[PDB]
Amino acid sequence: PQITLWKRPLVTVKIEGQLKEALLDTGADDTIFEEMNLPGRWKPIIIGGIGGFIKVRQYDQILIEICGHKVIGTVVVGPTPFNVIGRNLLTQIGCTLNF
């Protein structure tokens, strides 16, 4: 799928049996979701962005099915206004920027 940028690049994803919409974000190193539970042992970390830094929980090898592809990787959970698919997962679907 080719995606233009006239609107927010939101895709439907399935993570841990839950349906969500997440932002394909080339400016995010990492993937972060709002509150939810996930398998495995998590380490507490802190991520930073435009407005400051937030405390989040980091999970490794989480499965996300994004628009029909499958990816496994670190998924961080914490207070974000959007669900964001950082580059860690974008690489795994072979997502590129073109112009």
Residues 21, 3: Cα–Cα separation, whole Å: 15
The mark string for 16-45 relative to its own copies (x by CB under 8 A, - otherwise) is -------xxxxxxx--x-------------
* 30 contact, one of its own copies, ligand 017, none, CB 5-8 Å limit per kind: ligand 017
Contact 78, 58 (CB under 8 A): no
Q: By three-state DSSP, how is residue 26 classified?
A: coil
The least CB distance from residue 4 to ligand 017, in Å, is 17
Q: Is 25 a catalytic residue?
A: yes
Catalytic annotation, residues = 25
